[PDB]
Design a protein around this nucleic acid. Structure first.
Ligand SMILES: [Zn+2]
Lengths: 149, 65, 24, 88, 82, 101
RNA sequence: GGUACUGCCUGAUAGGGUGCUUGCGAGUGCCCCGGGAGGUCUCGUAGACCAUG
RNA sequence: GCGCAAGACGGACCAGAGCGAAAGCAUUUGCCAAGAAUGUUUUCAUUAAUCAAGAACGAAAGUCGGAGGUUCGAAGACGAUCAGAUACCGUCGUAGUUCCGACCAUAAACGAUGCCGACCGGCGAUGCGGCGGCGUUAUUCCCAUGACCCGCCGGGCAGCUUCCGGGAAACCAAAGUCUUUGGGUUCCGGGGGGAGUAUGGUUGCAAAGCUGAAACUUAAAGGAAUUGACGGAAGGGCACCACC
C-alpha cells in the first residue's frame, strides 16, 4: 500500500480500452499544442494543463491526440521546469514544515513527518540522478531549500 | 399409545373438503412485479388478476436497539 | 515471586558495586 | 435589594433547570450540543446564557443512533450563539 | 457458485463491480455536453469536473466541483456523448 | 488459556482508554472494562410514596426521579452479585438479561 | 351530491410533540349547541426492588 | 447562605465508535502546519518490498535545574485489628502528582499473533467518502442542499455464522492455501535451573540500560484439554439424628 503510511487503498484513474481519439473532438494536434503552450506560459505544471484540457476542452488524453505526452512537448519547445515538478512540490512542502517547526519546537509529530518527507525526497532525487535529469553533485540541503522553490 | 383403525379413523377425520376450494377466487390481487414475472412466462393475459397499488413507504425492518 | 527477586538482585548488585569500587 | 417596611423588592438574578429535568434529557444514543454567550443587554446588565440541545431520533428511523458529524455540530452551535445573542 | 462464466458476465453486474475490478477496466465517467439556457453556446465538460468551468461571453458559471461529481448550475441542460 | 475473545474489555482499535474511579471501591479501572449500571428510581421509595402524596400542597404532583450512573470494578460486582459467573457456552451470549416481561 | 371524524399544544381533519379513563395492559370516550335520560364504564392483572492442629 | 482565591480535573453525552508509527488522544473559539480514505479518461514512467550500520518519537515511575503547590500521596508518625502487623482499615503527612527546561529508553509497551503481496464460504451491522434510488420531512409548488429511508462500490474498527481448511487442543476466515513440504524479506528459540547473574566493553549526573558467559546442577520443568476431590466462590436441594 502506501509507502510512508499504514493505509492500503484503491483510488485511481482507469483509461478506457480505445486509444482512438473519438469523433466529436474538433481540435488538431497543433491546436492542442498551442493551447498547452500558452497555458505553460501562465506558469502551470503538466498536471495542471492535463486537468484544464480534460475539463473545459474535452481532451481525454492529450497523449492520444498529439502522439506525445505533455512534459515531452513542453521540454521540446524549451519551457520545462528545472527540476521535475513533483520533486519541486515535495521540496516546497518540506519548506513549509520547516518554517512552521521553527516556531513551535514542542511539536513532536511534525518533526516526525518532516523526517518522512525528507526520505521521500532522497528516494526521488536518487532516482533522478540515475536517470540523468539532475547533475549528480545535486544535493538537497536544509539551508538552500528555501531558494530552489 | 397408538390404538387401532385409529389410523383409519384419523384417515376419516382428516379427510374433509368444503364445496369449493379456497384456491378459487374470482379476483386475486397481485403486485406489478408479479405481473411482470408472469408476463415473462406469457401469462400476462390471465383474466382473474387485479393489479394492486405498491406501498409507497419502504419499511420492512425492525428498529435495532 | 519474580518482581521481588529481580529487586533483590538489584539490591545485591548495588551492594557488590559498593564493596568493589574502581579504587580496588 | 430594597426593603419597603415589611415589603421586599426583588430583582431578577439567575435562572436554571431542575436537576431532574437535566438528567431526564441526557441519553446514551444521542449527540448532545452545548454553547454559551456573554451578552450585555440594552440597560447594561451582563448575562452569561447557556444553551443545550439534542439530536432527535427520526420517526421511521431504523438506525439505533442519532449522531451529528462535528462540522454539523459546530454549525448548530454557531447558530444558537447567533440567535440568543441577537435576542438579548 | 462452482459454475460461473467469468467470460460472459451480465452487463448489470459489470455496472455494479468497481471500475478497476471489471473484466476490462472501464472508466465510470463520461464527457458530457452542457448548455446554458440563456445562450446558444455548447460546452464540453468532463463528468467529474474539478476546478470550475465557464461560458466565455456570458461569464456564466456552469458547475461547482464536488467530491464525486461536478454539479451544474440550475436549468442548464446536458447530454452524454456517445 | 485465553478466557474471553474480547479480554473482558470493550477495547478495540485504540491504544489506551481513560481510567475511572470505582463507585464502591475507589479502585481504578479503565472505562471499557468498568461494569456500568444505570439507575433510574424514585427519590422516595415504595410506601412513603402513598404517604407523602397526601401531605402535598400541590395536586397531581409527580415525584422526582433520581438518576445515578454506576461504575463497578470487576470484583465489586461479583461481590454485590450485580454480575455472576456462567457456563463456558453461555458466557458467549452478550444479550442483556430479560427484565422486560 | 354522497359519505366519514373531531383530547390539548404547534402549523391544515396532513406533519411534529404530548395527554387523561383504574395502580398497570387492553378496550371506550374526550370540537360546538340544544334537548333527552342513565350513572359508583367494561374486561383482564404481581404492580413485588429499601486462629490452630 | 452570600461572596472571594488557588490549583487541579474536563463528569453525564462515551459506544466492542473515531484519529495516530506507537506511546497515546474528549469544554468553547481562532491561528499553524500536516494525514488516511474517497473522487479523477490529471501528471511522472519502475522511481518499488523488507531492512545490519545509523537515526526520530517513546506511558508511569525516576533525576537534575527552575516556577507551583488543591487533591491524592510512597517515606515517616500515630490509632486500631492481631498471638505477632514495622500490613490490609483509619487520622495526619515528606518526595512526588501540575507547568516550563534538560536527562532516562524501560512495561502483561499484549492481538502475548513481524512487514509487503496473491488466492479461499456466507451473513447481517457500523464509520468515512462516492454512486444510484420510490417515499417522507426542514410546512404545502422548483431545483439545491441537510435529516431519516432502500441498495451498490473502496478502504477501515469489529461482530456472528460454517465438516474452507488448519491445529497438541483451547481455538483461528487466518494461526487457512504444510511430507501434495519453495511468493519476497527482517528479527529470533534449542530440556529445566544456574542467570539476564559474573566479567569485559559501552551509554548515563544517578538509578540503571544495551551486549552477555562458564564451572556446576538436574529427569523432568511445561502446554492444552479429561475425570475427580476440594473452595472462606455463585446456584439449587433435601432431613425433627436441621430449625421453625
Ligand atoms: Zn470496586
Amino acid at each position: 500500500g502506501r509507502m510512508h503510511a499504514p493505509g492500503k487503498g484503491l483510488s485511481q484513474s482507469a483509461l478506457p480500452y480505445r486509444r482512438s481519439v473519438p469523433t466529436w473532438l474538433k481540435l488538431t494536434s497543433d491546436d492542442v499544442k498551442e493551447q498547452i503552450y500558452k497555458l505553460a506560459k501562465k506558469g502551470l505544471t503538466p498536471s495542471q494543463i492535463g486537468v484544464i484540457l480534460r475539463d473545459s476542452h474535452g481532451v481525454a488524453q492529450v497523449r492520444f491526440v498529439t502522439g506525445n505526452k505533455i512534459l515531452r512537448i513542453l521540454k521540446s519547445k524549451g519551457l520545462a521546469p528545472d527540476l521535475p515538478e513533483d520533486l519541486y512540490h515535495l521540496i516546497k512542502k518540506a519548506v513549509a514544515v520547516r518554517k512552521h517547526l521553527e516556531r513551535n519546537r514542542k511539536d513532536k509529530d511534525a518533526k516526525f513527518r518532516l523526517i518522512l518527507i525528507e526520505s521521500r525526497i532522497h528516494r526521488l532525487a536518487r532516482y533522478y540522478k540515475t536517470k540523468r535529469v539532475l547533475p549528480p553533485n545535486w544535493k538537497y540541503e536544509s539551508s538552500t531549500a528555501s531558494a530552489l522553490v | 399409545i397408538s390404538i387401532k383403525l385409529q389410523e383409519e379413523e384419523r384417515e376419516r377425520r382428516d379427510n374433509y373438503v368444503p364445496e369449493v376450494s379456497a384456491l378459487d377466487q374470482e379476483i386475486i390481487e397481485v403486485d406489478p412485479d408479479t405481473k411482470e414475472m408472469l408476463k415473462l412466462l406469457d401469462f400476462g393475459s390471465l383474466s382473474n388478476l387485479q393489479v394492486t397499488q405498491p406501498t409507497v413507504g419502504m419499511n420492512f425492518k425492525t428498529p435495532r436497539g | 515471586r519474580a518482581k521481588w527477586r529481580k529487586k533483590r538482585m538489584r539490591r545485591l548488585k548495588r551492594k557488590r558495586r559498593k564493596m568493589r569500587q574502581r579504587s580496588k | 435589594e430594597d426593603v419597603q417596611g415589611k415589603n421586599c423588592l426583588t430583582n431578577f438574578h439567575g435562572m436554571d433547570l431542575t436537576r431532574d429535568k437535566m438528567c431526564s434529557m441526557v441519553k446514551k444514543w444521542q449527540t448532545m450540543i452545548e454553547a454559551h454567550v456573554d451578552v450585555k443587554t440594552t440597560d447594561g446588565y451582563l448575562l452569561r446564557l447557556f444553551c443545550v440541545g439534542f439530536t432527535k431520533k427520526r420517526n421511521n428511523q431504523i438506525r439505533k443512533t442519532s449522531y451529528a458529524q462535528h462540522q454539523q455540530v459546530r454549525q448548530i452551535r454557531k447558530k444558537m450563539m447567533e440567535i440568543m445573542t441577537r435576542e438579548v | 457458485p462452482l459454475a460461473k462464466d467469468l467470460l460472459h458476465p451480465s452487463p448489470e453486474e459489470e455496472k455494479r463491480k468497481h471500475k478497476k475490478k471489471r473484466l476490462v477496466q472501464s472508466p465510470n465517467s463520461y464527457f458530457m455536453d452542457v448548455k446554458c439556457p440563456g445562450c446558444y453556446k455548447i460546452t464540453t465538460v468532463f463528468s467529474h469536473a474539478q476546478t470550475v468551468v465557464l461560458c466565455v461571453g456570458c461569464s456564466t458559471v456552469l458547475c461547482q466541483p464536488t467530491g464525486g461529481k461536478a454539479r451544474l448550475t440550475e436549468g442548464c441542460s446536458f447530454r452524454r456523448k456517445q | 488459556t485465553k478466557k474471553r475473545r474480547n479480554n473482558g474489555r470493550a477495547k478495540k482499535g485504540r491504544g489506551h482508554v481513560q481510567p475511572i474511579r470505582c463507585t464502591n471501591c475507589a479502585r481504578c479501572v479503565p472505562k471499557d472494562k468498568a461494569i456500568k449500571k444505570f439507575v433510574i428510581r424514585n427519590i422516595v421509595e415504595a410506601a412513603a410514596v402513598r404517604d407523602i402524596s397526601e401531605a402535598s400542597v400541590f395536586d397531581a404532583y409527580v415525584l422526582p426521579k433520581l438518576y445515578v450512573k454506576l461504575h463497578y470494578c470487576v470484583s465489586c460486582a461479583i461481590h454485590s452479585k450485580v454480575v455472576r459467573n456462567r457456563s463456558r457456552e453461555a458466557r458467549k451470549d452478550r444479550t442483556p438479561p430479560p427484565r422486560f416481561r
